[PDB]
């Protein structure tokens, strides 16, 4: 029932004690946009010290109720929330599209990851166990993972609903309360999650929302009743060898660069192509790039939406200008795009860019752009690429395309990237295990480790006999 | 063959590439003492930036060799190290006593923990595995725990050999190298571990030692080739109820206060005693305290050695003076002790102190002393104690003495302490699981969690089929 | 909308390919009853060899489809099944009462365990992973837990819907098909589960139901295409010491003996009471037993329903007759009960029995009755009870009532029972972890172990280098 | 110090109470041989019912002591046993060859796995923990893995010392005793393990040895005080595709067939070779097979020793005769071998056999020979091999040789074998994880699962509040 060019926020954008509330305090005002049209969908207040304290106080009170509930009870409520997310999926997805600009196609995938996340941690809540140890003379020791208390979740604008779910679901599962601060660019979708938690049966104040930027963030970090804060080198390389499957290598390169309008750090933007296939590959990539459907993100066939902001679009367009000044050849795009739909005339659109004759010294190769810009770097040998792509940090991903699996594993072994892809590339947030493949699951280690972030181990030792005095 | 009043360091105190070396660069000079006699056992150079660089560079080189060895090979070496520590135990324990001042009796327990710790992480090294996940169409995702590289360990003076062992054993078991900076108070024992690692078969420079203070520490933290750095409300309460086992409560109180000369934060120095037993308990506690054998730490019957240095002893005596000014009754000790052996005359000795008529407003009750000082606070009800001991942080321990186990579990539940003891109290470092009970073992969570600190998870996704393009 | 004295089966009681079917081959005929009224609710054919073959062949085909689906897809379906069980709970619970005779109070608790069980194994399906190991020279090894194929589940009459869910949920979560053979006494409720699995989206034939007894069972076990079969000394002691909480000890004794009409092996029927409290306890237990509401199991206030069938009721009454012949004093019950409601006149009712002056030589003390019969044995010392109750097997449970927790732990340590209760008793099936406490959860070991029963570990080794020939 | 043609057993071959004993009771007599010479090294008594009882009663007494020792103490003893095995390795390995006939080369590998096994389970013993669960109102539930009691380990003749170690280490690590029955062919080496356990500090009776056959085995299974018994369709295929690395494929085929004189079921004896490379491969395999050094197993350069005994050697030669009658071409070997050393003149030697023009209808292809016999079957397509090798059971292994990894993984997926090898083949016992690769480790799952086999989970529930009565 919701469409592009019509949405306007009509309710308060903070959320405390199970209801939408206006900030009690100001730390500034921000404007949220519909990137597809360039319309202001909200002029909202950033939360001040007093508003931040009301949220934390109200979450501390909920924490006391929720932490005392069983893992079984907590699981029940989180599984309900996942069911509500699943039922209201298209409504949630369209709202994320309206405010962020990603295609409905990509918003649905992010929403899926969100309710899957909830189910996973709900399951972990119901199956949590500590250790029990036997001590001589009937004595014993035991451990328990306990919540920390009020957790602060800091959002980002690229995956607003998903970052909200990903932070709250494990924190809540362990028995914590959370005060969530969305990115000021994207305030809207986090409130849908807040409402859903309430509807599911979460105690009022367990999941609170405070809008604001840096000042709000500082107030949250400095708060004495806040237990923990959950925040959110060379760029991600993609190595294409001459022996690879060309069609799959091209598909992978496009997915690596133009999903989420290339606005993510997990994007494999440094495309190293072997000299022999270099000409054939570039020809095919440009042909395919020029065919990407740009327009209204609510349209099912749209694959490229607008960029997050006008400042952001301008910054990306500046990278393109610097690249051709540094000697790169713009094969296609990197120009402002004006869509055929008149309602989209002032949207933050640009044609996806493919740059060739790229060098390691270039700032477009050295720096993360956060726009749809592919840098094609030519290479000759396996030793050369490994030497050129060594500067990759653990926090980044990497992709390798070669029919030789000895070569593939050898390249992956030497690469310092945390996530490596052989004959594929997935653009998925860092938190998601196994490179965010659809039918992957989460394994057990991801959950165990993220649970440890939102908890602490309490140890109890019960002496059944007499004390062994050294004195 | 080694005794008190005779030891003098005759070799360099830094350790690089399998040998004792002298600092290349200097950041100051320090004096290490024999606390039992007050003798200078070493005048050593604090490592400067160039010395810190040589250590990290030599360890970066060792890591490259060691990380490539199998977990089985790494286990083999760490098990040999444990065997050597076990064989050379008395020699290591006397060295620990000479520089630190703890009784031989307590030093042996710390050396036992140290070789047990190596055996544990050796075992984990041999049994480490990542996850394997199945993906549609014969594709698969998998994970590997990888070492980080060069890790920094920062020693403390209260458990020198044990802290060196505790930080280096997991770090090395993951495939990392380590540059260790002992407390400048206690430089000696870390070199015995250094030598043992070499003897066990560790590649040269895998476990390096840099002496120094804050300046050396800063150069280590600021070093770009350093992957990780492992560093070392109210104080620990002990609640004695009128229904408890008096003899066990007294034994527990003495252990909680006078082990390691009361110089640890783990010590349960805030002793809350119920009004009825208060008189009977204090009488027994003073009787038992006055019987603690003070003297040469290398003597088998010694239970109390000297304090770490003269500044620390003076600071502790200052606390006692302020306490009697604040209105506390010194029941015994808190005075400088002159041992009967003349060689021990300038040792940092004091009689263990018992203070009564203590208040929550007193600085001796509010502040951690790091000396043998017991503060006895009278209480009337269970609600009162819980309200008075609520200010305890998670990093601290707590002890409860009551014959009513419902009362015991109720008290432990309300207490915020990370380690709670029912009808006992163990003074053991926070790292040690299950309150450091002698025949406890480590369980599996401790090892798993500490391994995660010294490692990182690498994910590889192997696509067996074709790429599913969104475009 | 469903009530006692009106239900009659109107559909076939076998289930294959997503529909109810009449057995293709016979192995006899059975009659299922409404124990509350003594009415025949069904006359059904026991499955023959050809019918058993059709169900295993059908399951083998569904297995091939299901085992190829992802853990995530399997989880989705199982969570839908749990949702449907939860929605249709009262309808399932009344059906369980109608055929089995347990109170709706207990029936609801049984249906709760069933859908909780489903959710737990759905969660495990989505998080399943094998191991990944690194081998020298880039080679690697990995494991995968694979389904077995067609699994066979044998039902029991005391927990019909619960046993069906408990066996099918883990088997299905792994990727197996299941042919389920309910107890001929209770054929009805398993078909509600089979219909729910279908409704949830399970492939036709993944959960097939074959009616029959021993012959049907043998054919299933003998079948070559059946991977695995899941089947359904002294008796469970309850030790009441003179120092215990009398009211809690009485409540625990009633729960331990008269839940599920005392028709389970988990029942703590051997009640050892210390000489001093023996008189006081017996007086209170009889007073409380005589207050148990016997009647229509569909009534909310009913705590005791009828016994499974007339043969069973007669067998239990026989035990009571032998007991008074052996010298026991029937304090209350053990007599045929004729309920006030005329529609229940022909139901399998008896008054719950309390026997005193019991001896270890008595057959009522030596043998499991499977009826509401409590045997009170007097005892004098802790050493005496431990000697008299030592004959308890690991498969049984045990209960201890004492205010002294050292005594409690000492008794539990010496007892050979697999499940021990201190100051409580739960009557729960063996499969359920942590003595089947409400708000316990399942922990992680239970699920892990039961998943291992329904799966097998496949190992794959990928050689990346050259083969190291011994020759 | 020990050499071929000189060894004679001079001590009793049963072991009870920390000493070698003569069986109390008999069930026949057997002769043990030196397969290299054909000499009788022992004429020993098979254990009767009374001897089996004495061993069990003795073990039961040591269990009571050992089960009460801490996990830490058992670990210490098992690590000592591993150290003694490691020190006395060459002595144990020569004894293993003397009686079994495997090459000292392979015997040393067996002995390595043995002491590695002990270390792994020693580590698990020290780190064992149960679960702890929190229940409402301060109540709690906890689990503990307890030993079973007296376990029985049945030996095999192909890995005598290794099987003894593989069964005794997890049982003893769990707190059980074990009564071990070696294969009557190989009685000697198990006594070396028995002696070592004693020397390490194991209580007398912990690891007892009863010599005997099937009769002795039955007595052990039938014994009422025995808790558990640990016992020892087409054959293992090896698929060589035309696209593979020929030299590696040949090496792998020789390893798969001629290691342990081809006397194991894990040997990949069904060698399917693609029509194109068939001629080239056969030529190379025969060339390499003819170069295998047959002789004194104690000689360092020996790769093939004699077969276990005269009957086995004769049975294998019979298979070769039937094969050429069925139409197979003996390319090399399958003939009695007379070694140049005159002391080995009556040893059970034969030349390793290579058969070509093999059919699926042949008994040499259908049946497991347990001798050095390779059956080369020609094939044309991938679909054909998968159809011909489908009959492989889960208990068997499989090997695939192809440069195409998609093909390799596709073949491995379709194969029903429990262990699959890509571009390699390891002949290792089933118990060993990750196809028994040298620097593999055991991972965590293997140990977890073999501990569960030798233990039972005891659950304790502590009620802190009031009993919730249904009545």
Author numbering:
A (entry chain B), B (entry chain A), C (entry chain C), D (entry chain D): 0 to 231, 256 to 494
What does the article say, verbatim?
Human ALDH9A1 is a cytosolic tetrameric enzyme of ∼216 kDa that was first purified from the liver and characterized as a 4-aminobutyraldehyde (ABAL) dehydrogenase (ABALDH, E.C. 1.2.1.19). The enzyme is involved in the carnitine synthesis pathway comprising three other enzymes: trimethyl lysine dioxygenase, 3-hydroxy-N-trimethyllysine aldolase and γ-butyrobetaine (TMABA) dioxygenase. In the present study, using kinetic assays and affinity measurements, we showed that among various available aminoaldehydes, ALDH9A1 preferentially oxidizes TMABAL with the highest rates at very low saturating micromolar concentrations.
Co-crystallization with 50 mM NAD+ with or without 10 mM TMABA product resulted into different crystal forms. However, the three solved structures from P21212, P21, and C2 space groups at 2.5, 2.9, and 2.3 Å, respectively, reveal an ALDH9A1 apoform in the absence of a bound NAD+ or TMABA. The asymmetric units of the P21212 and P21 structures contain two similar tetramers (dimer-of-dimers) and that of C2 only one. All monomers are very similar to each other with an RMSD up to 0.24 Å. The αβE region is not visible in the electron density maps thus is highly mobile. The first one concerns the αβE region, which is composed of the α-helix E and β-strand E, located at the dimer interface. This region interacts with the bound NAD+ when present in ALDH structures, and the absence of a bound NAD+ in the HsALDH9A1 structure is in agreement with this largely disordered region. In our three HsALDH9A1 structures, the inter-domain linker adopts a unique fold, never observed so far, preventing the binding of any substrate. The same fold of the inter-domain linker in the three crystal forms suggests that this linker exhibits such conformation in the apoform.
